[PDB]
Symmetry: D2
Subunit: 124 residues, 4 copies
């Protein structure tokens, strides 16, 4: 992918969470996520996809990934998906919006899903 | 996972899209997505995650997955993530909300992301 | 407005909530909202806006409104906004997505906002 | 309202849009919005609501408002709703997420709604 090298590595968001990802030539994202907030400790598996042949007109690179909040320490019975774009250059960023869904009863399902936004950088 | 068997298979949404998924014992989702709408033809790779040890209190099972809208036929320079829960039983459903991000210039980035909701069933 | 008459009246969503609205010739929406779920009882003030000169090509009519969840009975320290379109005809609908924000501390602000979707009809 | 004085005035977001609002003692928001981006020129009516008796535990103040993108100059056949909270103090902010719905045909309704986030400050 044009940005395989640009995306692969360690990223940090505004909450101090850590996103460790490898971008595959085939469009795969694989890695681990450590949340600095919520019902989470240590690393969680993530997987996702990215556009491995982005536009050459200065547009960002579309990508997304998922974490299910279960590991050997805790289970928050929830999953977050991040949808966003990678923007390359001196101050590289991944700009995302996310959806966090909990498992709920049918009676609480109206309140199942949080929305928010995270900005990832290669420093801090 | 408790719902590995329940989730694995072919699902259809209200737009007539087809979601073909395998649930792994390890919490993985792998498969293909065929959209009946938008800048899409034929199948696209998907990957995601699910809660492989959900609550036993009648709650749904949290999950999510990603499609990058690139395959051998087309590239829509975009990715969608679905976040939702699997609800088992006679009329099994996956109830989701989604985020579709396009690669954009910095000037158009305010308008990069669509939001919507899809309901998947095992029939139709 | 072309749909002033179509929008004005009593609407019901899939949760059994009641949306009582008047559409003004000037694009105003005014009325009351009664939620069948959550930290709510009785009616709450709402206000919003709609497109009073929609397209004549069969498109829906864009609109939105807000409820702050404070009245003489309760205060849930939260506000919901509905964004959607009115679709006229025999089975008239308002199809919406919503954002529910709570007042939070800066530490909990990542988890401040729910997202969901409501479909309003003139019956039930 | 506790923050009637804090909210009332001129606000600016990260795109250079201008939000002119009056907060009523009754929980009303009234004013005008000028977008620096998209299919917009000059001012548009807005209305909304806020929590006029917020929590006294350091939480923000929940609020929301709507703009229908019609005025005497243009009609973008769309409406945006902002949902968020007001955070008082030396560097006062309104932190929002928004939903922009267009009027669409039933065939395009899956792609009717954008989501994003705006941060408003009293300077710039």
């Amino acid at each position: 992918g044009r940005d395989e090298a640009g995306i692969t590595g360690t990223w940090y968001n505004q909450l101090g969470s850590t996103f460790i990802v490898t971008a595959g030539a085939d469009g795969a994202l694989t890695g681990t996520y450590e949340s600095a907030v919520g019902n989470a400790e240590s690393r969680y598996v993530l997987t996702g996809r990215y556009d491995s042949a982005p536009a050459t007109d200065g547009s960002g690179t579309a990508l997304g990934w998922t974490v299910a909040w279960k590991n050997n320490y805790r289970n928050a019975h929830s999953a977050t998906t991040w949808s966003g774009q990678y923007v390359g250059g001196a101050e590289a960023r991944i700009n995302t919006q996310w959806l966090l869904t909990s498992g709920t009863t049918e009676a609480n399902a109206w309140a199942s899903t949080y929305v928010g936004h995270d900005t990832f950088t290669k420093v801090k």
